[PDB]
Every structure is written in C-alpha cells, then in structure tokens.
Amino acid sequence: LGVYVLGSAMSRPIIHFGSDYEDRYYRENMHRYPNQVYYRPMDEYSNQNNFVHDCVNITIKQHTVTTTTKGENFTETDVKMMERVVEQMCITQYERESQ
C-alpha cells in the first residue's frame, strides 16, 4: 500500500446513463462512492489509458474493502456505476499530474 499515491479529494462528477432510472439512481447513491483516487506513480506509464485502467481497479478495490468492514454492500449496479465515475476521476487525476 506504500506503493500507491493517494490523491486529494475532488468533486464527484455527474454521469449520465441513457435512462432516467439510472441517472436518478446515480445521483441518489453517489455520496457512497469515492472522492479521491489511488494510483501508481505516473513514471510507470507510457500513456493515459494505461494509467487510468490501473487507477480504476485499485481505487475500486480499496473502497470496496474499507466500506465492507463498515457493513456496506455494493450491488452490481453499484460497481458498474463506480466503474464509470472513478474512470472520470482518474482522468482528472492524470491531468493534475501533467501540469
């Protein structure tokens, strides 16, 4: 875990899904999703898509283990939605690291 960088908080963005059911679900549940990302240092990646991919998996893993020792279950709808917003968040983090 000393191998990761833990970024500072950012505002969680709004994601849109193509139905009002999901847009609403998202908006109503999003406070339960993370607002900072874990990443490996920039100097290990030769490009953005690879940085982002790793950031998503690691961030999601840490968030799922730390809230499950707090009696929070995430459904498959939840992880699918975290996939999407952590992705945007990791991209923003990538931009923070490139000036």
Partner: antibody, heavy 116, light 107 residues
Framework: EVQLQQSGPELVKPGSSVKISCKAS????????LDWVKQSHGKTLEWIGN????????GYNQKFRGKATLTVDKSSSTAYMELHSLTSEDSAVYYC?????????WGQGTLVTVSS | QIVLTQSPAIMSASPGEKVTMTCSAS?????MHWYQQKSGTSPKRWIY???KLASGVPARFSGSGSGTSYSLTISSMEAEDAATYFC?????????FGGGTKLEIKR
C-alpha cells in the same frame, strides 16, 4: 408478475401516528426503487420520499421530513411509512410505487382519514 | 423546486381526433414521464423516458419534447382514453407532478 399489496384504510385521531405497509409480492429484482406518493382530494400528487430496499439508501422531500419516516423490512419484502403527528391535512390516499428500469407498479393506495 | 404546468387543464375531444396536451417545466429536465389515472384507480405509468410506452399502452399514444417543453399526443382519440393525465420529473429533489390534464370524449 410483481404486485404491491398496501395495508388497508385507517382512521386515526389527530395527534396520533400511523404506520402503513407496502409489500412487494412476487418480486425478483435486486436494485429497485420505491417511491411513496400522496394524493389529496383525488387530485393533486406529491412525492414524499423513497427507499432502495436492498440495501439502505433513503431520500425525503424536505416538506415531509419530520412528518414521514421510511424503512424497510428486507427479510419479508415489506416497506413501511410511518406518519407522525397527524392533522386533517394528512387525510389522503398514499401510494407506493415500484420502479425498475422500464417497469413500474403502483399499489392500490391506502386511504387515511384523520378525524376525531 | 421544478414546477410542472400542464395545459390545458380540461379538454374535450371527439373520437378519431388527434389530441395534444403539454407539460412545461420551470427549468430544464432531461426526461419526462407521464401517468394515466382513471377514476377510482391508482396512477399507472403511461410513457417513460420522454417517449417510450409502458407495457399495455396502445400504440396511438406518443411522447416528445426537450428542455422545458414536453407533450403527450394521441394520434386517434378513443372512448377508453378519457382520463386524467399527469406529467412527472426525476431531475431534482423534490420530484414533482403536474396538476393534470383531464381529458373527456364528445358523444
């Protein structure tokens, strides 16, 4: 195939409280949403709040905070709405409504009469 | 919050007539939902996500709009369609309903 049974009509004294139920009878979904809605004098519709029965998350209309409390019994698929401190403005029909993507179902409603 | 105004409030149409009723919003919404209520029964979702029909809803119904302006159209008025129709938004809390359009048929 899913059906929402709501509990039956209630006559309550002003100042009292009452709890009504809505159970999802045949349901197979994981994440669905349940809205609670009030209709006054068979006309005007108001959103009270919701719950995702599985697990936890609960939203209120600010106007009904302190008036309604929403909970869920997940082992028996039953959602509850507690109404606190009834006055005559609380007499109405109260609906629960299930949503899951394209599908929606309303319960048949619960008539609450607040009267001495 | 977001105030939904429906018009007209009460309308009469004859059979076979094209009918249009409008719901407009004080600020933008992404999608609109419409509900039918016949007297004595509970509301039933009729069109969701602006223009998709709920199950059991006849083909002659349709929906459209964007921004602050939405409509429900019946291509060809039938006796069974006489009811009250409400629009509804899920854009922000509190979710709100319009005041209804009461639709009657001429005979």
């Amino acid at each position: 195939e899913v059906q929402l049974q709501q509990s039956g009509p209630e006559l309550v004294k002003p100042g009292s409280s009452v709890k009504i139920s809505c159970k999802a009878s045949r349901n197979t979904f994981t994440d669905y949403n349940l809205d609670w809605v009030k209709q006054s004098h068979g006309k005007t519709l108001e959103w009270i709040g919701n719950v995702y029965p599985n697990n936890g998350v609960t939203g209120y209309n600010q106007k009904f905070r302190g008036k309604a409390t929403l909970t869920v019994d997940k082992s028996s698929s039953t959602a509850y709405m507690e109404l606190h401190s009834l006055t005559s403005e609380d007499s109405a029909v109260y609906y629960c409504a299930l949503y899951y993507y394209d599908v929606s179902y309303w319960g048949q409603g619960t008539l609450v009469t607040v009267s001495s | 919050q977001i105030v939904l105004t429906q018009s007209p409030a009460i309308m009469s149409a004859s059979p076979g007539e094209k009918v249009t009723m409008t719901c407009s919003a004080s600020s933008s919404v992404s999608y609109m939902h419409w509900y039918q209520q016949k007297s004595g029964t509970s509301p039933k979702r009729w069109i969701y996500d602006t223009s998709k029909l709920a199950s059991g809803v006849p083909a002659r119904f349709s929906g459209s709009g964007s921004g602050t302006s939405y409509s429900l159209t019946i291509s060809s008025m039938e006796a069974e369609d006489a009811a009250t129709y409400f629009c509804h938004q899920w854009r922000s809390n509190p979710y709100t309903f319009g005041g209804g359009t009461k639709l009657e048929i001429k005979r």
